[PDB]
Amino acid sequence: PGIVELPTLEDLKVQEVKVSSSVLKAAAHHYGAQCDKPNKEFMLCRWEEKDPRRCLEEGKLVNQCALDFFRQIKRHCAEPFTEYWTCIDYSGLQLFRHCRKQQAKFDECVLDKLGWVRPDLGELSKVTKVKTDRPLPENPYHSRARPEPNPEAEGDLKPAKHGSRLFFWTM
Amino acid sequence: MNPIIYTTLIMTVMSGTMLVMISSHWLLIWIGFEMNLLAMIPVLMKNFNPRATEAATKYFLTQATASMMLMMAIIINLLYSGQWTITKMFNPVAMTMMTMALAMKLGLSPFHFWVPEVTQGISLQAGLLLLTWQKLAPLSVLCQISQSINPNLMLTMAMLSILIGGWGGLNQTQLRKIMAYSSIAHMGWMTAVLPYNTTMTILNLLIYITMTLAMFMLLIHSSATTTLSLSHTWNKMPVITSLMMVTLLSMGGLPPLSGFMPKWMIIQEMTKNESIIMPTLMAMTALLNLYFYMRLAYSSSLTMFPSTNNMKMKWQFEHTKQMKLLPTMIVLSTLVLPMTPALSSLN
Amino acid sequence: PFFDVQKRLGLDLDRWMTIQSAEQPHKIPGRCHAFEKEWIECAHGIGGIRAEKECKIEFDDFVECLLRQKTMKRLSAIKRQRDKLIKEGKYTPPPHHLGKEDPRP
Amino acid sequence: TMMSGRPGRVPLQFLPNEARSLPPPKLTDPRLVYMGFLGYCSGLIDNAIRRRPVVSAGLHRQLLYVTSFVFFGYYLLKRQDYMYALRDHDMFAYVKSHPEDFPEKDKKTYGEILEEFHPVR
Amino acid sequence: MNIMLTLLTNVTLASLLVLIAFWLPQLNAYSEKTSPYECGFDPMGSARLPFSMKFFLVAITFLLFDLEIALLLPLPWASQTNNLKTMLTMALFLLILLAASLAYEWTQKGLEWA
Amino acid sequence: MPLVYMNIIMAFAIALAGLLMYRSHLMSSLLCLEGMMLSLFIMSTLIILNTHFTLANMMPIILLVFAACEAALGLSLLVMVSNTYGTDYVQNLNLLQC
Amino acid sequence: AKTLLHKYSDIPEGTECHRKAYASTSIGGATGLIVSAYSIALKPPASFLEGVARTGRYTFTSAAIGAIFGLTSCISAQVREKPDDPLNYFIGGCAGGLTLGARTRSYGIGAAACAYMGLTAALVKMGQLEGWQVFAEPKV
Amino acid sequence: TMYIAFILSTIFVIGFVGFSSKPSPIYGGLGLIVSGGVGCGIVLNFGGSFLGLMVFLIYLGGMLVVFGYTTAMATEMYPEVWVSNKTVFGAFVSGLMMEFCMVYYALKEEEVEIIFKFNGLGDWVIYDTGDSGFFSEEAMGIAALYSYGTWLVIVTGWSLLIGVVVIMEITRG
């Protein structure tokens, strides 16, 4: 067949979000609300192109907005956030119900210094509309031409010319 | 066995066959086969005898082996295709395994050995079901996959089935064993045309079912399981033995009787596909079946055998059990040749 | 005798598990959903005889996805050649392939 | 399997609606009369088996035999005629749509064709 | 692989206990001591003779009951579906059929022994 | 195919050969039947898991159910033979010939 | 199976009689081994040595029949210079039947086997020449 | 440890040979026990925790009733082991030799075609790189039996009830 096109090592280099899973989970609720716009565009791209190599640029914008999200936290809510994710990091399940006291401290500072409001229950799971400008892919599956269907029927029925033409049977 | 329980078991056998003939999933076809076996074993052992237990054990072993091979073939076809639908099987090895399994279920030779034994072990009531209803599901499965069937293997099995059925029928004096070998020969006849035209297989199956229903119901109406016991029936009821002679002549494939229809149509279809040696050999080998049918006709009606004195008392009484379908099955199995152009309805 | 009572009465008794491209709980896609979708849509309505030869590229791709026989053959050839090169010292595995560089997140 | 996979075929339907465009078999059809004859023979055999007067006993039973046989034979014949009409229609359509596979042959009269003469001595 | 390690450690510990049991004590064996125990008297027949099961039917049905228990195990996950009506009806159907099979075996004197 | 598939298919073949080759007891034949059923379960399970055929993950359980149904059938036939002959020896099944 | 068939048929008629005879012998030996296996399965020998003897006898009979048939047919084709005449195969089949009778030590068996085998071999040759299909591919 | 599945499959074949040679059914029982446990191990290694534990549990319970019968029906005064009869030992040795030959042929020769085409690479290769998320895909597919597979549930339940009935009818004399 052909040669699988692969993007070069340079063009898939991004400033990685070098934080931990516990850190991400602590800020996840606010991250979903603030970084909604670029993340949803990337998800729409991946779920319409169905090819990771056709959404690298949108993937880069996810990290850039994710880094910008944490930069504001470090500048306005550094210490209360560090208390929050340290508590979450302790539990093996990384539960939210064992750190509600620290969560309220982080939400209170963020609501004042940055103005962010934590999304309510059942709000980060809703299906959203994404207004993009990249054209909708015409053939995402790279499908071949569908074979021509067989000829479809004909007009009305008429009796067999001489009935059943089975040997000596005249009818 | 309680009549309610017997009716439930019979309905479970029928529901298993209908599941096989109705589903589009291989797993459900295998499930229907399993249900058929599960509900058939006690039906085989309705009358408890050591011979009945032996027949049930042999039938269970054979059908279990066949079902295991069929499920292995299904699993291999899924592995090589990722498909469960009953369609063109995509693996030759899986096709061969499935063909062997289905031939073993049908009793096609050289998987014929269990049929004469299981048929003899069970009563006439169970033998009728075994030789008529138990052939529907595997034949339907074969008809659904006739495109993927390797013609060489199926034709070899059919020819061997006809040869072995004829040869086995000649040395048999037990009526049930004669019926079993005749069933083997007719199954070979049916499976001969499977790669060519399945509607001819359906026609042969219908004709064979009618003939075997008539024969088994006549045997039940005479309560005869051996040639000597059937010979006495000329004295008490000559009508039954005359109808039996007519049905045997029909089973031989003698025109103008209905038994000529399947062989004639099969030879036609096989000659349409430029196969001239195989149908000729099959027609010539049918003469052995015709031979043992004629021998039975002699011992039963064409010639009269010595009766016993106690038949005088039996002369006074009339049969109480009445099989309502027997006259229709006799008529359909003897006088339907003028109606072959009805073949199209089976399309 | 495939008495297709399901298509007649409209019931769906077993057509939901015939293929892996059908609806599955929580929309968990099959490993070869795309290939099977292409093969089925290519070979829909044209008959089995035509589907065997016409939509054969799609079926070959589907089989390759299912079993990965040719991909495994290529990988085995690569492994054998790499081993032969290492035996003769004509090749040196890179540090990221030797567990010396931190893998990207 | 030929007609089993025809497009538009509704499963488990004895007579499709398109069959009504064909003339129904006449009630005086010889095939229908033979179906009635088969029913009468079935009635006679039923009388013979149950040891009752073959030609007179149970006129209602023989009548029912004949009626059922004629009814089912009429429907069976209608289906058979429909299927043969379908076969002819499909064959004609396939011939029309494939002119290359069924070309007209040059019509040479016997005066032109040379067929060898084999004497009988 | 941790479960494999645990299994290996347990098996090795048990086999080491067996080894110490069979090689630490002072062994003095003779024919009479190793003879089968039959409450001080010599056994009449072999212990490998047939031993009739008076509850054979119970075991053969316990086979199918274990099958039904295997069918019922996925229930905790089955409650997480959106088709709770169909799921509940099918689960109750399986349980009703199990109860019906038990009742049939009970009434037809199948659970009784001998 | 992976070598595990080869091993499982070979196990099924060995169990089939064992079942087809009786020696004395009918119990060992049922053992070979159960072994074939187990091999088919393992094969189907590996196939379903590997291809992520989620909706087909219930197939091996159904196979197991009908497997132990056949096992119960075999066990009941075994007890009847033992009751009728005293041993489960396959040679006692000899009345029905040809 | 078809490997041996094409190892025998690809050899042209009346050429390489030794190799043709060897191929026919191999086919006969395979058939005899199949027959021996079936006989052992259906009619069990009392001892392993008895089974080996039965297998050896059947295999030797079948292989001798095949070798004699091949040699006779090829020699007839060579001498008569008629590769496409079924009489060669008829003579080969009758020779095979005579060898079968010799192995069974019965004149009647020998004569009957000669007749039937010769007829069948002539039929096979005629089918090869004309194109008769024992197993016809479904064509309709 | 990269070939754990292959080792388990070899033990599977060994156990199948063990109970296929037909020793005393008691010993065939432990042969099937080992085979079932190792198959559970394989299925666990492929991600089928519930399925593997299910075969382990069912066969463990099933072979128990077989053992009960082995001591009631198939009880020989001298039960035979794999080293008790030259027929049983021959079958066992033949099975082991067949398994070893095929394993050696498959390993030393990467591509092996006995009946199907087998590749000598490790089974880890065929694994997928996808993420199931907060799912046990096998568990969800199995639990879909009560939602999607209503027909399967009905047929299986009916078959089990009819199986109980059939057992009672068979074992009644």
Short mmCIF file of C-alpha atoms in Angstrom, two decimals, chain B residues 14 25 44 68 72 82 91-92 111 117-118 121 127-128 139 144 162 166-167 196 206 258 261 277 288 313 345:
data_model
loop_
_atom_site.label_atom_id
_atom_site.label_comp_id
_atom_site.label_asym_id
_atom_site.label_seq_id
_atom_site.Cartn_x
_atom_site.Cartn_y
_atom_site.Cartn_z
CA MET B 14 -40.20 -28.21 18.55
CA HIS B 25 -27.29 -15.66 15.23
CA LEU B 44 -36.20 -41.18 23.77
CA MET B 68 -19.01 -29.32 20.26
CA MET B 72 -15.77 -24.85 17.53
CA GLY B 82 -15.83 -11.25 13.59
CA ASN B 91 -12.91 -19.89 6.88
CA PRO B 92 -12.47 -23.19 5.00
CA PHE B 111 -21.49 -40.81 10.83
CA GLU B 117 -28.98 -48.47 17.00
CA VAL B 118 -30.80 -45.46 18.46
CA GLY B 121 -33.61 -48.94 20.91
CA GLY B 127 -38.48 -43.42 16.31
CA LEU B 128 -40.91 -41.43 14.17
CA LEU B 139 -30.97 -29.54 7.01
CA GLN B 144 -28.62 -21.55 4.83
CA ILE B 162 -26.84 -43.85 -0.14
CA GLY B 166 -28.83 -49.61 0.86
CA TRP B 167 -26.25 -52.15 1.99
CA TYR B 196 -26.92 -27.19 -6.48
CA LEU B 206 -41.16 -33.09 2.57
CA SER B 258 -44.88 -39.87 -5.20
CA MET B 261 -40.71 -36.93 -7.56
CA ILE B 277 -22.02 -39.86 -13.24
CA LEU B 288 -30.87 -51.91 -2.96
CA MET B 313 -59.90 -63.28 19.66
CA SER B 345 -44.25 -22.76 -4.05
#
